[PDB]
Swiss-Prot record:
NALCN complex consists of NALCN and auxiliary subunits, UNC79, UNC80 and NACL1. These auxiliary subunits are essential for the NALCN channel function. UNC80 bridges NALCN to UNC79. It is found in: Cell membrane. The lineage of its organism: Eukaryota, Metazoa, Chordata, Craniata, Vertebrata. It comes from the Eukaryota. The gene is UNC79. This is Protein unc-79 homolog. The chain holds residues 615 to 818 of 2635 of the full protein.
Length: 141
């Protein structure tokens, strides 16, 4: 009944609703439905590693840390429910994010020196912590 752009447009609204004001201590049953959304062989739609998380990726390739903090909050609230990702996607996507925000931080350092964001490292703790989740899922020995 629907297309790829449909669920690409309507997934983060549902995810902010389940993130922000839902008590996240009763998500024991969500890892069945959410995995059938997010596993390739569970739902027989032609799923991909780019179109599935592309709405996050459009904010990773040059949008600032104001929206990236809540983006990594969705990745955090998503990983706490056993969401299995391939590792090279996370490594490449986090590398693109850190070089984009490093270029933006160099742009901020030249905003006080045009003639000649910073609390996001507190969110980078959670970025590192999240990385440990996929090690806790995939690389267990």
């Amino acid at each position: 009944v629907i297309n790829q752009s449909v669920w690409e447009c309507i997934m983060p609204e549902w995810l902010e609703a389940i993130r922000t004001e839902v008590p996240d201590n009763q998500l024991k049953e969500f890892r069945e439905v959410l995995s059938k959304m997010f596993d390739i062989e569970l739902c027989p739609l032609p799923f991909s590693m780019e179109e599935m998380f592309g709405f996050i990726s459009c904010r990773f390739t040059g949008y600032p840390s104001s929206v990236q903090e809540q983006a990594l909050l969705w990745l955090h609230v998503l990983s706490e429910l056993d969401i299995m990702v391939p590792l090279q996607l996370l490594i490449s996507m986090f590398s693109d994010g850190v070089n984009s925000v490093k270029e933006l931080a160099n742009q901020r350092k030249s905003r006080v020196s045009e003639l000649a964001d910073e609390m996001n490292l507190n969110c980078f703790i959670l970025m590192f912590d999240l990385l440990l989740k996929q090690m806790e899922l995939q690389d267990d020995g």
